[PDB]
Design an enzyme around this catalytic site. Structure first.
Site, PDB file in Angstrom:
ATOM      1  N   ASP A  16       0.853  -1.197   0.000  1.00 53.25           N
ATOM      2  CA  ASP A  16       0.000   0.000   0.000  1.00 53.25           C
ATOM      3  C   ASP A  16       0.887   1.245   0.000  1.00 53.25           C
ATOM      4  O   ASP A  16       1.081   1.893   1.027  1.00 53.25           O
ATOM      5  CB  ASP A  16      -0.915   0.031   1.225  1.00 53.25           C
ATOM      6  CG  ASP A  16      -1.790  -1.194   1.358  1.00 53.25           C
ATOM      7  OD1 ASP A  16      -2.532  -1.497   0.408  1.00 53.25           O
ATOM      8  OD2 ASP A  16      -1.760  -1.839   2.427  1.00 53.25           O
TER       9      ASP A  16
ATOM     10  N   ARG B 190      -6.329  10.469   1.513  1.00 53.72           N
ATOM     11  CA  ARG B 190      -6.188   9.359   0.579  1.00 53.72           C
ATOM     12  C   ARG B 190      -6.969   9.548  -0.715  1.00 53.72           C
ATOM     13  O   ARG B 190      -6.742   8.799  -1.671  1.00 53.72           O
ATOM     14  CB  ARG B 190      -6.646   8.060   1.238  1.00 53.72           C
ATOM     15  CG  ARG B 190      -5.884   7.698   2.507  1.00 53.72           C
ATOM     16  CD  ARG B 190      -6.464   6.443   3.128  1.00 53.72           C
ATOM     17  NE  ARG B 190      -6.130   5.245   2.364  1.00 53.72           N
ATOM     18  CZ  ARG B 190      -6.640   4.041   2.603  1.00 53.72           C
ATOM     19  NH1 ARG B 190      -7.520   3.878   3.581  1.00 53.72           N
ATOM     20  NH2 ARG B 190      -6.275   3.004   1.863  1.00 53.72           N
TER      21      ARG B 190
ATOM     22  N   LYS C 215      -9.276   0.839  -5.734  1.00 49.59           N
ATOM     23  CA  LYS C 215      -9.906   0.475  -4.474  1.00 49.59           C
ATOM     24  C   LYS C 215     -10.617   1.704  -3.925  1.00 49.59           C
ATOM     25  O   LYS C 215     -10.250   2.836  -4.246  1.00 49.59           O
ATOM     26  CB  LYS C 215      -8.867  -0.069  -3.474  1.00 49.59           C
ATOM     27  CG  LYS C 215      -7.881   0.964  -2.961  1.00 49.59           C
ATOM     28  CD  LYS C 215      -6.765   0.312  -2.112  1.00 49.59           C
ATOM     29  CE  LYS C 215      -5.914   1.370  -1.427  1.00 49.59           C
ATOM     30  NZ  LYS C 215      -4.732   0.805  -0.685  1.00 49.59           N
ATOM     31  N   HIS C 216     -11.652   1.491  -3.105  1.00 50.31           N
ATOM     32  CA  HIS C 216     -12.217   0.193  -2.746  1.00 50.31           C
ATOM     33  C   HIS C 216     -13.608   0.031  -3.356  1.00 50.31           C
ATOM     34  O   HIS C 216     -14.515   0.798  -3.040  1.00 50.31           O
ATOM     35  CB  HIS C 216     -12.321   0.051  -1.227  1.00 50.31           C
ATOM     36  CG  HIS C 216     -11.062   0.404  -0.496  1.00 50.31           C
ATOM     37  ND1 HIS C 216     -10.691   1.707  -0.237  1.00 50.31           N
ATOM     38  CD2 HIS C 216     -10.092  -0.377   0.036  1.00 50.31           C
ATOM     39  CE1 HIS C 216      -9.543   1.713   0.422  1.00 50.31           C
ATOM     40  NE2 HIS C 216      -9.158   0.461   0.600  1.00 50.31           N
TER      41      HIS C 216
ATOM     42  N   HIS D  73     -28.336  -0.912  12.041  1.00 56.65           N
ATOM     43  CA  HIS D  73     -29.011  -2.145  11.651  1.00 56.65           C
ATOM     44  C   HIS D  73     -28.072  -3.172  11.029  1.00 56.65           C
ATOM     45  O   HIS D  73     -28.540  -4.217  10.566  1.00 56.65           O
ATOM     46  CB  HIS D  73     -30.143  -1.832  10.664  1.00 56.65           C
ATOM     47  CG  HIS D  73     -31.441  -1.485  11.322  1.00 56.65           C
ATOM     48  ND1 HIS D  73     -32.661  -1.700  10.714  1.00 56.65           N
ATOM     49  CD2 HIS D  73     -31.713  -0.947  12.534  1.00 56.65           C
ATOM     50  CE1 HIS D  73     -33.628  -1.309  11.524  1.00 56.65           C
ATOM     51  NE2 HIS D  73     -33.080  -0.847  12.634  1.00 56.65           N
TER      52      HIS D  73
ATOM     53  N   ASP E 197     -10.395  -6.836   0.553  1.00 59.17           N
ATOM     54  CA  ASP E 197      -9.736  -6.188   1.672  1.00 59.17           C
ATOM     55  C   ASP E 197      -9.324  -7.257   2.688  1.00 59.17           C
ATOM     56  O   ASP E 197      -9.745  -8.416   2.607  1.00 59.17           O
ATOM     57  CB  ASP E 197     -10.654  -5.138   2.300  1.00 59.17           C
ATOM     58  CG  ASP E 197      -9.895  -4.075   3.095  1.00 59.17           C
ATOM     59  OD1 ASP E 197      -8.644  -4.132   3.187  1.00 59.17           O
ATOM     60  OD2 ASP E 197     -10.564  -3.169   3.633  1.00 59.17           O
TER      61      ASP E 197
END
Ligand SMILES: [Cl-]
Ligand SMILES: [Cl-]
Ligand SMILES: [Cl-]
Ligand SMILES: [Cl-]
Ligand SMILES: [Cl-]
Ligand SMILES: [Mg+2]
Ligand SMILES: [Mg+2]
Length: 342
Positions: A62, A132, A162-163, A175, A246
């Site tokens: 990364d 980023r 990504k992502h 929820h 991921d």
């Protein structure tokens, strides 16, 4: 070949890792700062990983810039994508891609988990790791991330968008356990999914995040959903390259699946290379056994994608000290370009 990327504990391959690699032959490895201490040490590590593998292994990192950089122990720092976007310098984006490619290639790294194609829709959204994102709308992200990806690949290092399906829209939801994107698919293709569609030729691969898309699949996150991966990503977005997941070892994904079950589910859903980044060895044999239960034609389809990626991987530059010095020199000046623009 075990269909996964696995992490490595330290500066050299240890005894348990080497035995597992010889036996299971993982498609590749992901490196972190714990693997990167000196140029000679890193080149020795990546040389060992290639020698232990019959195939040409993915060796990934990364190396985004800013707060997501793995080369600080080498003195190699890079500005954040957001800072180069604020600077407005087109040449600065080119140079981030060119310098990243040159330095990773000198280290024997062959794939970079970048560009981030997430959109920073509002300056009020989640900023766990700030800086980023390449822009606050799809079109700016496509322009800047496309220039970046083009010059990373021009230098011989594979890219990864990504992502998927676009973290900029993902929200907490009481929820659900994982972050949730409640947008309709049509609106998604106009916004957060658009950079992945527009940049397919520049993307060697795509990484999917552990995000719920309830209007498409309310039971499994994107990385484990056949409807998201085979339906949305493969059929409607049309992406034919390698799909990474991921990390399966950290985060809320671990409170619902162990990494071996998660990796198998992601392969069944149509991902190619699940990521098993941290303490991977307990999980690999269960995966290698479960993988014989996959549809043989799907397995063949996925293998050809991984084999295509493998054939495009580049080998490290021959040893040349002045080459690495130029990497440091250009990286430093890139940080100074940005600082002088603030
Ligand atoms: Cl070990
Ligand atoms: Cl060094
Ligand atoms: Cl920043
Ligand atoms: Cl947008
Ligand atoms: Cl494609
Ligand atoms: Mg050092
Ligand atoms: Mg090899």
């Amino acid at each position: 070949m075990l269909p996964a990327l696995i992490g490595i504990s330290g500066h050299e391959v240890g005894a348990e890792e080497e035995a597992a690699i010889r036996r299971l032959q993982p498609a590749g490895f992901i490196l972190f700062s714990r693997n990167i201490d000196s140029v000679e040490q890193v080149r020795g590590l990546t040389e060992s990983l290639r020698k232990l593998c019959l195939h040409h292994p993915v060796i990934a990192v990364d190396q985004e810039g800013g707060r997501v950089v793995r080369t600080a122990s080498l003195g190699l720092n890079l500005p954040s994508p957001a800072s180069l976007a604020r600077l407005g310098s087109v040449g600065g984006i080119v140079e981030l891609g060119a310098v990243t490619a040159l330095a990773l290639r000198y280290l024997g790294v062959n794939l970079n988990f970048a560009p981030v194609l997430d959109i920073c829709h509002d300056p009020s959204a989640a900023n766990a790791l700030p800086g980023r994102c390449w822009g606050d709308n799809a079109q700016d992200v496509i322009s800047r991330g496309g220039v970046y990806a083009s010059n990373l690949r021009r230098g011989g290092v594979q890219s990864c968008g990504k992502h998927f399906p676009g973290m900029g829209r993902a929200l907490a939801d009481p929820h659900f356990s994982l972050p949730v994107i409640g947008l309709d698919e049509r609106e998604l293709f106009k916004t957060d999914l658009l950079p992945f569609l527009a940049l397919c030729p520049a993307l060697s691969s795509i990484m999917s995040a552990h995000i719920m898309l309830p209007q498409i699949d309310p039971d499994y996150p994107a990385t484990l959903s056949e409807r998201v991966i085979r339906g949305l990503l493969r059929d409607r977005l049309g992406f034919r390259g390698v799909v990474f997941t991921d990390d399966l070892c950290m985060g809320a994904i671990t409170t619902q699946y162990s990494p071996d079950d998660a990796a198998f589910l992601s392969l069944k859903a149509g991902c190619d290379l699940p990521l098993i980044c941290h303490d991977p060895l307990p999980w690999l044999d269960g995966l290698a056994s479960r993988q014989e239960s996959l549809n043989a034609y799907d397995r063949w389809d996925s293998f050809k994608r991984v084999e295509k990626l493998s054939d495009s991987l580049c080998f490290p530059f021959p040893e040349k000290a002045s080459l690495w010095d130029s990497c440091l020199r250009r990286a430093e000046a890139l940080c100074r370009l940005e600082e002088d623009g603030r």
